[PDB]
Amino acid sequence: SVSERTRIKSDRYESGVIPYAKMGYWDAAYSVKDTDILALFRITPQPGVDPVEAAAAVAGESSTATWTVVWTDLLTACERYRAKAYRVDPVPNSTDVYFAFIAYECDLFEEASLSNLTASIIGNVFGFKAISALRLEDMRIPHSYLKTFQGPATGIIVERERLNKYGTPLLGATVKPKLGLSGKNYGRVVYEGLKGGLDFLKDDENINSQPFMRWRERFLNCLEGINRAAAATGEVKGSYLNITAATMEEVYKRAEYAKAIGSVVVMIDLVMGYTAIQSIAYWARENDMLLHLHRAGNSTYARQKNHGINFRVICKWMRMSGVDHIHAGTVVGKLEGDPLMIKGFYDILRLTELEVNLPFGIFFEMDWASLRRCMPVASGGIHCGQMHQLIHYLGDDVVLQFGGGTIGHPDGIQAGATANRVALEAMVLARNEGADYFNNQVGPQILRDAAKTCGPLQTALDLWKDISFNYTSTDTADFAE
Amino acid sequence: SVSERTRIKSDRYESGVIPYAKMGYWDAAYSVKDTDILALFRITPQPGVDPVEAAAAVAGESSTATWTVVWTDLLTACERYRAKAYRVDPVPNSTDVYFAFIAYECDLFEEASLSNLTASIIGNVFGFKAISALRLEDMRIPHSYLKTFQGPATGIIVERERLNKYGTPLLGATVKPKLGLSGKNYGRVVYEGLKGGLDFLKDDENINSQPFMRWRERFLNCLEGINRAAAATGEVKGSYLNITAATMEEVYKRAEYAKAIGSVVVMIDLVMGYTAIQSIAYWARENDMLLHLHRAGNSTYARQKNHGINFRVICKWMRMSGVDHIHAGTVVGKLEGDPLMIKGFYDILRLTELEVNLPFGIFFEMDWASLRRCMPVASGGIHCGQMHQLIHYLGDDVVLQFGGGTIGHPDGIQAGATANRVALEAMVLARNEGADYFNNQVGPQILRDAAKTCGPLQTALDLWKDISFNYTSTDTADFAE
Amino acid sequence: MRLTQGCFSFLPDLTDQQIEKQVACAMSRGLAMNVEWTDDPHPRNNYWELWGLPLFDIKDPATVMFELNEARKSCAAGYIRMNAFDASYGTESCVMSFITNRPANEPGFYLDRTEGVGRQIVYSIKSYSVQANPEGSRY
Amino acid sequence: MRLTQGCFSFLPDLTDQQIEKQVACAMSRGLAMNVEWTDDPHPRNNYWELWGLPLFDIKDPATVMFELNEARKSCAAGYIRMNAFDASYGTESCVMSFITNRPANEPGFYLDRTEGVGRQIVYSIKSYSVQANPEGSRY
Amino acid sequence: MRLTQGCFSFLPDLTDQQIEKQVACAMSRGLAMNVEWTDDPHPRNNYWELWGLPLFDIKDPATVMFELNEARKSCAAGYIRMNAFDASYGTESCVMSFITNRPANEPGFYLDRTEGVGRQIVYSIKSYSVQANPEGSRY
Ligand SMILES: O=C(O)[C@@](O)(COP(=O)(O)O)[C@H](O)[C@H](O)COP(=O)(O)O
Ligand SMILES: O=C(O)[C@@](O)(COP(=O)(O)O)[C@H](O)[C@H](O)COP(=O)(O)O
Ligand SMILES: [Mg+2]
Ligand SMILES: [Mg+2]
Ligand SMILES: [Mg+2]
């Protein structure tokens, strides 16, 4: 039989099952190339599974391997395309959880395609029986791959130039109640909030088009409110018009409508997915539109330390895709946010390069290849009494969003917006004068001082003075200082 | 002050913070409507958080509430739009985890939009500090909402009619190595596998367009291999051409190319996201194309019992969106799959209606509103020696995919395909004759009997007879019998 | 070559006893059987010729085998297949189809290739038996 | 009305001592200061008039305050703003801009509405001061 | 006619001695040899039938010649080609392919012309041997 005579008989390519660590996917001596994509996984092997074999299995099944040997490897430059796990460290203060570093050849990935990158890195390995939990913690995207991506359509710098706003954080608010308002009443809230002092308002993530309000009614009424507030104040104003929809055709229809009526900004939800997001990021650059990304659904995989994808990796993928804003946490609000993790997210979104900074969760040095800077958005259960903490943790280039913290003001929406803006400006001015504003005596006193001549701020500070959200975090650091 | 005089002073709408369970989001006496969307969450409250308050917080922040009271509720029919948590039960064999049922008004949701449904149900609630873990376990999508969705472009019944294949599971295989092959060699593997007996082959999920193989080279060479195999056998043949790409424009270009050259089928990856998936599902129906969904990335949120989205909910959303195939597990292969959970997924994809079946994880009765049936795909680390288990667990309407289990055959790809097809047909024939084929004595003997006259099957059975993937599952039932 | 339409064509030709057990299985599930004949083996030849009506109200598998053997006596050389139809909601379709008779020699097919645009090929699968002789005289 | 361009316009008009502290902060960060004037308050009037060159090599905040007070003596009634420029890679842009002078009376703006297609309105923000008088005599 | 696919088909049919020299050259460069058979000579018939697996680990040219002569004993009348594969990065492709066996009489092809739009012709190259007989009976 010719098939029997030509059976392959080498150790590596005779038919049968061999461990991934013997198939080429483990190399403790591998020399990382500056063009390699690097991944860091937190691996929890099943009982009895060798930690290096588990790391090699992730490397193999996210690059070229399957569960049994295949001769067709020999029709390729197989050694080049195999990913290599090259370092496996115990996680601090843990039994049988490991940090595994894996290197992927540049050529494995389709240029400019987040769906292709994620198809390999997260496609199947999270479901492998032999690993009981797996988390993607960080990635080193090399300069050469980054240059194939657009990066943010606008970016922080051009965004502030379009708004003519420099020196303080930007300010915004989600319209509330989340659902139920009519288009006309939506425009009223937007008008009042912008007139009262906010730079932006925004559609809630689940406001798209619904029986109680179809989207064109919302868009036209909001443009009247925006332009009314602009003429009342002398400022560029806007509201994030949500163009999230079922199909790409409908998304483009809403985007084109927003452009046609002169909106400065639109917003999209992460549930629309990577391919729609990249499509609209290119569109936003081509149509002079700010692109706000709400991270809907992110916490389904980003919440727990043992399994999923750390949000800091999402930050890199979305800055690559090219959104101009992304929600990134508050520390002190109603949503999860350990301060070391949050500060790491903000650095990833905003810096030109990253240095290893383990307490912040920055495991890789990484140049951002002059991709534009993405504006983080701090939103959810915050209020103006916390302004010293927000400035301290989150810095200058951020949008601070106060939905309930604006519309919940007893003296009306304009008053709620004014309170937020006075508190913001008073805090920044004091900071620049050298105040120790993060101090629990100084910061709150700066706000009380400003409130002496601002009734709306006095009312807001008294209303929400007792509000905090202090709970044990799930997404925490592994290294101290 | 007019603002002071007109301040709202009622218990419910005076400014300030009140518990979600006092805001209308908890109602133990709520009468569920047949048009309501129902969700079942597994909730792990933080220490000290009342379980009913936690359920009301999920209901509120996934419908109309925010963290402080807002008078703008009074501009809406607010009681209609509030979601209601209406039942909170302890999870069996647990003191701190709860099953929470929540009802959502039909009108909250944009017709035919998965991105809008998910914007509400999963948008923000998984990140709330007050809940340390949250999992969406099941949903009751009402008949009225389902009728707004297409459902599967083709569906199991018309799919088999297009293939002229009735009476056994369908058969397939992923081309291996995952990455590195050229277009010409890809067509060679496809030709050999189809000629040897397979109904389909498929691009790996991470095969899109890359330096080692650009996609048009793959598509044209595969069409030569497909048509060669069809003329050699007298059967309809195909290969899932992967049209996953960075942008919707590029996805459509690859879809249109596949149609223009006569492919029966294309495939897409879940990482492309919901909006692209719905767009291509409509396109597939309009262009007479089978649409195969690979669930890349699903296990990042579907693996762990405490947090995320159970894959059975993904099954519902993807059958609604309208893919024709979805990967749904093997039980006995290399990827996670407890048999009770997997049997539940297959029922959700294939049945015309669902009855409560708690050991299978089916928590809601649900009519599928005559949306077409979605073909489950069993793939990953399986081999023909397991055929009696695959037939038992997974039934008749499934595609059984053997990548390594075909290409890893020592006597070549055609021999690997032939062994798989002989094993499949011999098992189904014996089952229909009344054999107790799932029995560990009967099933394997049926295969050895067929192998006595089929050399490729004898070789495959001896090669992989010791292979199993036996590990503790993470995604397990809460109820027995 | 061997035409491998049908769901059992990678097994040896079925005996009458084997066929009756498949029929008995389908009828025990309440399915309707019918028998069809063709001498055009093309993979896209959807509509083989009906042998009478489907046997909707038949309860004895021996009656199905009787009609199969009458079709075998009466039809020209070629292919016969046995189908089982499920009229229930959610299916309303064939759920099993296998070959009961095939010619002793099937020449099979070749692939006709037309030069399309660019590098595209316009393909046609051609049957040797069909191109040579009319229906009823092909085998 | 109060023009609320600039980053401190929801606070009272800044004193010279307050302005000097903001200048001192920016100069301690190595930023370049400049002073600009306009009597067109339109939100899209990007290019206010330069008062000399930016003070790139100046190190004493008193020198910046000197130039601000020379601009105040020389410029027509209207607005003056103080800007801080960051030439660093990754920024190369203004990082702070606030109003140092405003007219005693600003009439503000009205919204001109043109009937567009369908229900769309074509908007133009019109300044009362600009439509009435030429540059240099608007306030 | 003479089919002039392959890289030495304008030279006389190669002797086994000449073939072995070409094989020895390719193997000295580390290439993998394989042998393939067809009786469809169409220029667009990419995938001739594999004679076993490529001989990746073979180092003696006589072993390749042994397999060639086993193919010659076993295959039907038609064509056999010898290929050399270079798996190295930058190539990952065949780098030599030549005919080792051809039929004694090849009738060749004709050009089928369909009337296209305007003056365009839609062409199909048709093999006399393939249109006449099935695979394995063509020569
Ligand atoms: O729906 C919400 O709750 C919000 O509108 C906040 O409203 P409030 O301002 O009234 O709290 C935001 O979408 C969340 O902050 C998103 O969270 P994150 O930014 O963490 O993604
Ligand atoms: O890349 C892979 O491993 C596979 O091609 C299987 O190859 P083998 O057939 O060689 O195992 C499939 O994509 C996985 O089965 C997907 O898993 P699931 O079906 O669970 O989503
Ligand atoms: Mg929101
Ligand atoms: Mg795969
Ligand atoms: Mg013709």
mmCIF file of N, CA and C in Angstrom, chain B residues 88-155:
data_model
loop_
_atom_site.group_PDB
_atom_site.id
_atom_site.type_symbol
_atom_site.label_atom_id
_atom_site.label_comp_id
_atom_site.label_asym_id
_atom_site.label_seq_id
_atom_site.Cartn_x
_atom_site.Cartn_y
_atom_site.Cartn_z
ATOM 1 N N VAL B 88 -37.506 35.951 43.924
ATOM 2 C CA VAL B 88 -36.119 35.728 44.317
ATOM 3 C C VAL B 88 -36.067 34.447 45.136
ATOM 4 N N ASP B 89 -35.371 33.432 44.618
ATOM 5 C CA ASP B 89 -35.232 32.135 45.283
ATOM 6 C C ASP B 89 -33.772 31.866 45.610
ATOM 7 N N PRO B 90 -33.488 31.190 46.718
ATOM 8 C CA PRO B 90 -32.111 30.749 46.957
ATOM 9 C C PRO B 90 -31.706 29.714 45.922
ATOM 10 N N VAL B 91 -30.458 29.798 45.477
ATOM 11 C CA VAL B 91 -29.904 28.738 44.625
ATOM 12 C C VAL B 91 -29.719 27.480 45.464
ATOM 13 N N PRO B 92 -30.079 26.298 44.956
ATOM 14 C CA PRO B 92 -29.883 25.062 45.732
ATOM 15 C C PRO B 92 -28.447 24.889 46.204
ATOM 16 N N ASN B 93 -28.303 24.430 47.448
ATOM 17 C CA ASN B 93 -26.999 24.137 48.034
ATOM 18 C C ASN B 93 -26.118 25.384 48.028
ATOM 19 N N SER B 94 -26.697 26.484 48.505
ATOM 20 C CA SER B 94 -26.022 27.769 48.589
ATOM 21 C C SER B 94 -26.754 28.644 49.599
ATOM 22 N N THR B 95 -25.988 29.424 50.362
ATOM 23 C CA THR B 95 -26.556 30.312 51.366
ATOM 24 C C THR B 95 -26.496 31.783 50.975
ATOM 25 N N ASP B 96 -25.793 32.123 49.896
ATOM 26 C CA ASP B 96 -25.546 33.519 49.560
ATOM 27 C C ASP B 96 -25.745 33.817 48.076
ATOM 28 N N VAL B 97 -26.347 32.909 47.313
ATOM 29 C CA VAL B 97 -26.567 33.099 45.882
ATOM 30 C C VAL B 97 -28.044 32.878 45.599
ATOM 31 N N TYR B 98 -28.602 33.689 44.701
ATOM 32 C CA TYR B 98 -30.039 33.735 44.490
ATOM 33 C C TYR B 98 -30.373 33.687 43.006
ATOM 34 N N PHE B 99 -31.495 33.043 42.698
ATOM 35 C CA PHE B 99 -32.097 33.123 41.371
ATOM 36 C C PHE B 99 -33.145 34.230 41.406
ATOM 37 N N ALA B 100 -33.028 35.207 40.509
ATOM 38 C CA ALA B 100 -33.930 36.351 40.483
ATOM 39 C C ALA B 100 -34.608 36.455 39.121
ATOM 40 N N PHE B 101 -35.940 36.486 39.123
ATOM 41 C CA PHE B 101 -36.744 36.594 37.908
ATOM 42 C C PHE B 101 -37.179 38.042 37.729
ATOM 43 N N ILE B 102 -37.031 38.566 36.517
ATOM 44 C CA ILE B 102 -37.319 39.969 36.252
ATOM 45 C C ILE B 102 -38.142 40.056 34.975
ATOM 46 N N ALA B 103 -39.206 40.859 35.006
ATOM 47 C CA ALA B 103 -40.090 41.052 33.864
ATOM 48 C C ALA B 103 -39.899 42.448 33.279
ATOM 49 N N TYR B 104 -39.814 42.516 31.948
ATOM 50 C CA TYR B 104 -39.589 43.755 31.208
ATOM 51 C C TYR B 104 -40.734 43.959 30.224
ATOM 52 N N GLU B 105 -41.293 45.163 30.204
ATOM 53 C CA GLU B 105 -42.355 45.504 29.263
ATOM 54 C C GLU B 105 -41.877 45.413 27.797
ATOM 55 N N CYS B 106 -42.727 44.837 26.948
ATOM 56 C CA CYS B 106 -42.453 44.652 25.516
ATOM 57 C C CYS B 106 -41.931 45.927 24.845
ATOM 58 N N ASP B 107 -42.576 47.046 25.156
ATOM 59 C CA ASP B 107 -42.257 48.346 24.571
ATOM 60 C C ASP B 107 -40.888 48.931 24.928
ATOM 61 N N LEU B 108 -40.173 48.327 25.882
ATOM 62 C CA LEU B 108 -38.830 48.804 26.193
ATOM 63 C C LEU B 108 -37.853 48.594 25.041
ATOM 64 N N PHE B 109 -38.160 47.716 24.095
ATOM 65 C CA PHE B 109 -37.145 47.185 23.201
ATOM 66 C C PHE B 109 -37.409 47.553 21.748
ATOM 67 N N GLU B 110 -36.339 47.912 21.043
ATOM 68 C CA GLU B 110 -36.451 48.156 19.615
ATOM 69 C C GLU B 110 -36.736 46.845 18.895
ATOM 70 N N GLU B 111 -37.754 46.865 18.033
ATOM 71 C CA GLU B 111 -38.093 45.704 17.223
ATOM 72 C C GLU B 111 -36.884 45.219 16.425
ATOM 73 N N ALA B 112 -36.681 43.901 16.435
ATOM 74 C CA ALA B 112 -35.703 43.195 15.610
ATOM 75 C C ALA B 112 -34.255 43.558 15.926
ATOM 76 N N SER B 113 -33.963 44.111 17.106
ATOM 77 C CA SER B 113 -32.618 44.593 17.413
ATOM 78 C C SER B 113 -32.041 43.850 18.607
ATOM 79 N N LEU B 114 -31.111 42.935 18.337
ATOM 80 C CA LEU B 114 -30.388 42.288 19.424
ATOM 81 C C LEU B 114 -29.515 43.287 20.177
ATOM 82 N N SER B 115 -28.906 44.242 19.470
ATOM 83 C CA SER B 115 -28.088 45.219 20.182
ATOM 84 C C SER B 115 -28.921 46.030 21.174
ATOM 85 N N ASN B 116 -30.190 46.306 20.865
ATOM 86 C CA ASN B 116 -30.982 47.034 21.849
ATOM 87 C C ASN B 116 -31.380 46.142 23.023
ATOM 88 N N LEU B 117 -31.790 44.904 22.747
ATOM 89 C CA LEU B 117 -32.118 43.974 23.822
ATOM 90 C C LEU B 117 -30.946 43.814 24.787
ATOM 91 N N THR B 118 -29.746 43.587 24.247
ATOM 92 C CA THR B 118 -28.576 43.388 25.093
ATOM 93 C C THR B 118 -28.112 44.690 25.740
ATOM 94 N N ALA B 119 -28.324 45.838 25.089
ATOM 95 C CA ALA B 119 -27.995 47.106 25.734
ATOM 96 C C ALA B 119 -28.703 47.243 27.079
ATOM 97 N N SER B 120 -29.952 46.783 27.170
ATOM 98 C CA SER B 120 -30.656 46.834 28.448
ATOM 99 C C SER B 120 -30.252 45.684 29.364
ATOM 100 N N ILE B 121 -30.348 44.445 28.873
ATOM 101 C CA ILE B 121 -30.285 43.294 29.766
ATOM 102 C C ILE B 121 -28.876 43.102 30.322
ATOM 103 N N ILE B 122 -27.840 43.369 29.526
ATOM 104 C CA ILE B 122 -26.477 43.151 29.997
ATOM 105 C C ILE B 122 -25.649 44.423 30.026
ATOM 106 N N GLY B 123 -26.225 45.576 29.690
ATOM 107 C CA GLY B 123 -25.411 46.759 29.473
ATOM 108 C C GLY B 123 -24.513 47.193 30.622
ATOM 109 N N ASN B 124 -25.097 47.436 31.800
ATOM 110 C CA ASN B 124 -24.355 47.979 32.944
ATOM 111 C C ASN B 124 -24.417 47.131 34.206
ATOM 112 N N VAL B 125 -25.442 46.292 34.371
ATOM 113 C CA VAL B 125 -25.703 45.708 35.689
ATOM 114 C C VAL B 125 -24.607 44.748 36.135
ATOM 115 N N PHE B 126 -23.799 44.217 35.215
ATOM 116 C CA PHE B 126 -22.753 43.287 35.629
ATOM 117 C C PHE B 126 -21.579 43.980 36.305
ATOM 118 N N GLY B 127 -21.505 45.302 36.235
ATOM 119 C CA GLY B 127 -20.435 46.048 36.861
ATOM 120 C C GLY B 127 -20.823 46.733 38.154
ATOM 121 N N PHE B 128 -22.026 46.491 38.679
ATOM 122 C CA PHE B 128 -22.467 47.222 39.862
ATOM 123 C C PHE B 128 -21.709 46.744 41.087
ATOM 124 N N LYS B 129 -21.165 47.698 41.853
ATOM 125 C CA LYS B 129 -20.359 47.357 43.027
ATOM 126 C C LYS B 129 -21.132 46.490 44.012
ATOM 127 N N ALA B 130 -22.423 46.779 44.202
ATOM 128 C CA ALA B 130 -23.189 46.133 45.270
ATOM 129 C C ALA B 130 -23.429 44.651 45.021
ATOM 130 N N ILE B 131 -23.091 44.149 43.839
ATOM 131 C CA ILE B 131 -23.265 42.747 43.492
ATOM 132 C C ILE B 131 -21.895 42.198 43.113
ATOM 133 N N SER B 132 -21.431 41.172 43.832
ATOM 134 C CA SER B 132 -20.076 40.687 43.583
ATOM 135 C C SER B 132 -19.995 39.730 42.397
ATOM 136 N N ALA B 133 -21.106 39.123 41.996
ATOM 137 C CA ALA B 133 -21.118 38.270 40.816
ATOM 138 C C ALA B 133 -22.541 38.222 40.280
ATOM 139 N N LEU B 134 -22.659 38.151 38.956
ATOM 140 C CA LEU B 134 -23.965 38.173 38.305
ATOM 141 C C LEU B 134 -23.885 37.325 37.046
ATOM 142 N N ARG B 135 -24.862 36.443 36.838
ATOM 143 C CA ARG B 135 -24.908 35.644 35.617
ATOM 144 C C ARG B 135 -26.314 35.644 35.039
ATOM 145 N N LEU B 136 -26.420 35.929 33.743
ATOM 146 C CA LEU B 136 -27.686 35.771 33.032
ATOM 147 C C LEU B 136 -27.825 34.308 32.622
ATOM 148 N N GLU B 137 -28.808 33.609 33.202
ATOM 149 C CA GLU B 137 -28.985 32.171 33.016
ATOM 150 C C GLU B 137 -29.983 31.806 31.921
ATOM 151 N N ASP B 138 -31.083 32.540 31.794
ATOM 152 C CA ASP B 138 -32.116 32.208 30.816
ATOM 153 C C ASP B 138 -32.959 33.448 30.552
ATOM 154 N N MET B 139 -33.664 33.438 29.417
ATOM 155 C CA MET B 139 -34.627 34.482 29.092
ATOM 156 C C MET B 139 -35.858 33.857 28.449
ATOM 157 N N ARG B 140 -37.024 34.480 28.693
ATOM 158 C CA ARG B 140 -38.271 34.167 27.989
ATOM 159 C C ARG B 140 -38.492 35.304 27.003
ATOM 160 N N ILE B 141 -38.168 35.071 25.739
ATOM 161 C CA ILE B 141 -38.469 36.019 24.672
ATOM 162 C C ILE B 141 -39.896 35.745 24.211
ATOM 163 N N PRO B 142 -40.819 36.697 24.338
ATOM 164 C CA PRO B 142 -42.214 36.407 24.005
ATOM 165 C C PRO B 142 -42.417 36.293 22.499
ATOM 166 N N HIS B 143 -43.484 35.572 22.149
ATOM 167 C CA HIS B 143 -43.867 35.371 20.750
ATOM 168 C C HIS B 143 -43.922 36.688 19.975
ATOM 169 N N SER B 144 -44.492 37.738 20.580
ATOM 170 C CA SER B 144 -44.659 39.012 19.873
ATOM 171 C C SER B 144 -43.318 39.644 19.508
ATOM 172 N N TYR B 145 -42.308 39.510 20.370
ATOM 173 C CA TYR B 145 -41.002 40.074 20.027
ATOM 174 C C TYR B 145 -40.282 39.204 19.003
ATOM 175 N N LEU B 146 -40.402 37.879 19.128
ATOM 176 C CA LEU B 146 -39.755 36.955 18.202
ATOM 177 C C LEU B 146 -40.197 37.188 16.766
ATOM 178 N N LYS B 147 -41.474 37.527 16.563
ATOM 179 C CA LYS B 147 -41.996 37.710 15.206
ATOM 180 C C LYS B 147 -41.351 38.909 14.532
ATOM 181 N N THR B 148 -40.694 39.785 15.289
ATOM 182 C CA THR B 148 -40.024 40.924 14.652
ATOM 183 C C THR B 148 -38.655 40.529 14.085
ATOM 184 N N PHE B 149 -38.149 39.365 14.490
ATOM 185 C CA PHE B 149 -36.843 38.863 14.070
ATOM 186 C C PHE B 149 -36.982 37.868 12.923
ATOM 187 N N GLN B 150 -35.918 37.758 12.119
ATOM 188 C CA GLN B 150 -35.958 36.852 10.977
ATOM 189 C C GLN B 150 -35.892 35.390 11.406
ATOM 190 N N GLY B 151 -35.104 35.082 12.428
ATOM 191 C CA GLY B 151 -34.751 33.699 12.672
ATOM 192 C C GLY B 151 -33.797 33.232 11.579
ATOM 193 N N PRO B 152 -33.404 31.962 11.626
ATOM 194 C CA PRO B 152 -32.386 31.464 10.722
ATOM 195 C C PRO B 152 -32.715 31.704 9.245
ATOM 196 N N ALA B 153 -31.719 32.217 8.533
ATOM 197 C CA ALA B 153 -31.823 32.514 7.107
ATOM 198 C C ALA B 153 -32.374 31.327 6.316
ATOM 199 N N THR B 154 -31.833 30.146 6.613
ATOM 200 C CA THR B 154 -32.195 28.907 5.937
ATOM 201 C C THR B 154 -32.893 27.938 6.884
ATOM 202 N N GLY B 155 -32.243 27.572 7.982
ATOM 203 C CA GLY B 155 -32.820 26.641 8.925
ATOM 204 C C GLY B 155 -32.543 25.199 8.534
#
